[PDB]
Design a protein around this ligand. Structure first.
Ligand SMILES: *[C@@H]1O[C@H](CO)[C@@H](O)[C@H](O)[C@H]1NC(C)=O
Ligand SMILES: *[C@@H]1O[C@H](CO)[C@@H](O)[C@H](O)[C@H]1NC(C)=O
Lengths: 7, 424, 429, 9
C-alpha cells in the first residue's frame, strides 16, 4: 500500500 | 476522558519540533487536549519501526513530550509495524516492546499501534500460529498493552478502519467481529467514518460500527487532510459531523493539512464544535486568524481577503460561496462570448474585478510579518493568483475587437484521462 | 573573471542557512565560483528593503558570508527596491546606502541592484526629476556603485530583463538604450535570454543584446526554476546554451528549483558545461550527475533516470517519459480494437507504470530523509497519476467483457484531482 | 507584467 487505497 | 485534538497522521514531510510545540499551545489555548504522533514518513514510526532512537533523537523526543505535559496536551506515541512484522516471531514482539519501552523512558505514557494501509494476507509462519489476520493483530496488541502496565490511553487502528474497507460490510465483518471480541476493553479503536475522507459521519453509521467493535470508537478524521493531491488545501470549517456524535464517540483526532500554518481554521473550528453552525465557526476562526497577519514593525491583509482565500480552498466536497460564484460567472462569460449586450460587458468587468481581489490577496499576504504563514501557503496562493490572472486575460481576449506544459508530465497524462473534470 | 554558479532568486520559501552552506560546499567541489543572494520573498531583500538586519539576522548573515569566503565562493548581495522607492527623494537614496553599508560591514564585497518585475511607471516626484524610468534607475545605480568604492563585482538587473519584456523589442528599446549608454562600464547587466524561461539562448540573441547594453551580459538562467508552476520540477541537464556563449558572456548564474536537494543535476551539469570550455553533451552530463547523485541516497540508478525523465526540462520530457506518453496516446487512440498488438503493448505499458511505483516506494524507503522530503510531493503526484493511468489502461482492456464505467459509484476525493484551481484551469483552451 | 509572468503571447 502506497496510500489509503487498496492495491 | 473524551480525546479531542490532532493526529499528525499524513504522508510527506512531517512537522518539526518548533511546529509541534506551537501546535500544543494552540491546542491548549482552544481547550483541545490530545496529540497523536503518527507521521507516515517519519522513518522510525513505520518504515524503520524496529530501530531505536539515537541519543540526539531521544533528546528531541523527550523535549517534545515535556512540552506536551507543559501545555497539558496528552501525547500519544503511535507505531506502525504492520508492513513486514512476523506476528508469531518472539524477536518481533520483543523489538516492539523495546521500542515502546524506550519511548516510555522519554516520559510517554500513552500509545497506539496502527495497522492501517496493509495487506490482509499473513506469512506462512503466522498462518501456522493464528487463525486470522485479526487474531494476529489483537494478540500482539493485547500483549503490548499488558506489558506496558495497561496504560490509561492505548489506541488500536484497524486495517478495516472505515465503512468502505469493511469486508463484506461493517455489520458482518469477520475481521471486526474478532476485534470486537478479543481486543481488551481498555483499548480504544480508531475509525475514519464511512470512507477514508468522510463527507459525513452519520449517527447511524457510528451506532453500526460500535455494535461490532463493542465500544465507541475514536474518530481519526481526514476531513482536512491534503496529502493526497498536491493542488489541494482545506481552510473551510469542520463540517458534516453532528454534535450528537459526541456522546457516541471516545474522541475525534483531526489529521489536517500537511502545511502546519494552514491548519488554523481546521483546528479552531474543531475546538468550536467540541465546546454548532459551520459558517458561524468559520467566521469566528477567520476573525481570530486575522490577528496573525500583521505587517512587520518597521524603523525606516483583510478579513475579506481571508474569506476569499478560504472559499478558494474550502473542503474536500464543497467550494466556499465566493469560489463557486466566480466559477459560475466564468462559465457563463465563456458560454455567452459569441455575443461579442451591455450584459456580457457589465458582467465581464465585474468578473475582472473579482480576479483582481485574488491578486490583491496574494500581494497583501506577501507583506505579512509571520513569514512561516506566507511560506506554508505560498504555493497554493501563487497557483490560484496565476490561474486567475490567466483567466482574467482570457476574459479580456474574448472581449478585444482584435502554459502548453502546465503541470508538466503529470498534467499531460491527467488531461488524457477522458474522465478528467468529471466532478467539475 | 567569469562568474559561474547559482542565484537564489526565486519566489517562495527561501533556503535556510545550513542549506546555503551546503550549497557553497557543492559549488566549490564542482569548481563553480559565485553565489548571488536574491530570494524574492526574504522580506528585507525586497518587500521591506529599507529595513536593517536585526542583531540576530546580522550574526546569521555574517556567518553565511564567512562560510562563502571559507569555500572560496564570491558572495554577491542583491537588493530589490523598485516596488516603492522614490528615486529622486534624498532620504530614499541614503536609506539604500545605509542598508548596503550594513551588509558591507558583514564582510560582503560584491553587490547587486535588481529592477526586474516592477511597474514600469514613476511617481509624480521622479517624473519632475528624470526624463525616463531607465534614467531614474541608472542614476541611483551609478551613485550607489560610486558610493561603495566601485566594487570589483556589481550587478544591475534591468526591468527589461529578457526579449519578451523589452518595449517595443530588444534592438530598439529606449529603456535598454539608456541603460547601455549611461550605466557605468564596470557595472554588469543581468539577462535571462529571449524569454523569462529560455528554451534556448542563441549566440545571435546575445550579440544583439550586447550591442545595445554595450557589454557582455551575465546570464540569470531560469532553465531549472520551478516557482511558477506548483506541479513541475526540473531534474534534466543544463541544455540549449552552446558552449560558444562562454567567450561572449561575463557569467551564467542559474536560478534553480525551490526545493534545495532537487538541484543536484541542475548545478552539477551547469558545472560540466562550464568546465568544458572555461564540446558538451547534455545526455552525458546527465549521466555523470545522476551517477554521482546516487551516492547521496534501495534506490537504483535506473530509479534516478526514470525520475529525471519524468521531471526533466521546461520544454521537454526525458526519453522514458516521452515514451510512456506516446504509448498511452497510442493505447488510447486504438482501444476500439479490443488486437494482439494492443494487448501486448498494454501489458508493457502496465509494466512501465510498475517501474514508476517501484521508484516511488524505494525512494520512500531510502536513508537520505532530507532528499526524500524535498522531492516527496512530486514523486507522490507522479506515482498517483501513473497508478490511475495504469488502471485506465486495464479498464480499456476489460471492455471486451464489461460495460461498467471507469468510476463505479461514490469516490474518495483523490479520484478527481486539482480542486477549484483545476476547475478554472480546465475551462481554459 | 510582474511575478515573472507576462500576459500570453
Ligand atoms: C489514509 O489516507 C489519509 C489521507 O490521504 C492519510 O493521511 C492517512 O495516513 C491514511 N491512514 C488513515 C487511518 O487515514
Ligand atoms: C522571474 O522569473 C523567475 C522564474 O519564475 C523568478 O524566479 C525570478 O524571480 C524573476 N526574475 C528573473 C530575473 O528571472
Amino acid at each position: 500500500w502506497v496510500d489509503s487505497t487498496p492495491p | 476522558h473524551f480525546l479531542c485534538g490532532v493526529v499528525e497522521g499524513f504522508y510527506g514531510r512531517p512537522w518539526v519540533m518548533e511546529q509541534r510545540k506551537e501546535l500544543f499551545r494552540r491546542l491548549q489555548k482552544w481547550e483541545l487536549n490530545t496529540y497523536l504522533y503518527a507521521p507516515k514518513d517519519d522513518y522510525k514510526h513505520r518504515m524503520f519501526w524496529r530501530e531505536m532512537y539515537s541519543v540526539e533523537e531521544a533528546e528531541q523526543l523527550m523535549t517534545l513530550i515535556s512540552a506536551a505535559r507543559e501545555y497539558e496536551i496528552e501525547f500519544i506515541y503511535a507505531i506502525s509495524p504492520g508492513l513486514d512484522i512476523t506476528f508469531s516471531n518472539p524477536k518481533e514482539v520483543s523489538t516492539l516492546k523495546r521500542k515502546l519501552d524506550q519511548v516510555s523512558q522519554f516520559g510517554c505514557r500513552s500509545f497506539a499501534l496502527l495497522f492501517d494501509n496493509i495487506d490482509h494476507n499473513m506469512c506462512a509462519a503466522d498462518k501456522e500460529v493464528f487463525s486470522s489476520f485479526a487474531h494476529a493483530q489483537v494478540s500482539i496488541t493485547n500483549e503490548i498493552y499488558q506489558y506496558l502496565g495497561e496504560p490509561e490511553t492505548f489506541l488500536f487502528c484497524p486495517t478495516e478502519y472505515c465503512g468502505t474497507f469493511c469486508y463484506p460490510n461493517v455489520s458482518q465483518s469477520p475481521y471486526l467481529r474478532t476485534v470486537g471480541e478479543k481486543l481488551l476493553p481498555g483499548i480504544e479503536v480508531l475509525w475514519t467514518g464511512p470512507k477514508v475522507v468522510s463527507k459525513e459521519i452519520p449517527v447511524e453509521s457510528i451506532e453500526e460500527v460500535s455494535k461490532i467493535i463493542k465500544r465507541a470508537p475514536v474518530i481519526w478524521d481526514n476531513i482536512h487532510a491534503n496529502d493526497y493531491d498536491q493542488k489541494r488545501l482545506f481552510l473551510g470549517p469542520y463540517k458534516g459531523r453532528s454534535t450528537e456524535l459526541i456522546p457516541r464517540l471516545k474522541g475525534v483526532l483531526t489529521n489536517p493539512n500537511c502545511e502546519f500554518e494552514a491548519n488554523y481554521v481546521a483546528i479552531h473550528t474543531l475546538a468550536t464544535w467540541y465546546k454548532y453552525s459551520p459558517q458561524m465557526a468559520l467566521k469566528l476562526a477567520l476573525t481570530e486568524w486575522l490577528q496573525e497577519f500583521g505587517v512587520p514593525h518597521q524603523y525606516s491583509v483583510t478579513l475579506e481577503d481571508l474569506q476569499l482565500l478560504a472559499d478558494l480552498f474550502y473542503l474536500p466536497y464543497e467550494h466556499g460561496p465566493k469560489g463557486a460564484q466566480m466559477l459560475r460567472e466564468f462559465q457563463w462569460l465563456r458560454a455567452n462570448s459569441s455575443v461579442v449586450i451591455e450584459e456580457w460587458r457589465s458582467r465581464a468587468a465585474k468578473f475582472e474585478e473579482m480576479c483582481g481581489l485574488v491578486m490583491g490577496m496574494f500581494t497583501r499576504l506577501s507583506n505579512c510579518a509571520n513569514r512561516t504563514i506566507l511560506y506554508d501557503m505560498y504555493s497554493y496562493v501563487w497557483d490560484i493568483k496565476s490561474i486567475m490572472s490567466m483567466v482574467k486575460s482570457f476574459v479580456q481576449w474574448l472581449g478585444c475587437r482584435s502554459w502548453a506544459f502546465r503541470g508538466g508530465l503529470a498534467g499531460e497524462f491527467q488531461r488524457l484521462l477522458p474522465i478528467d473534470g468529471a466532478n467539475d
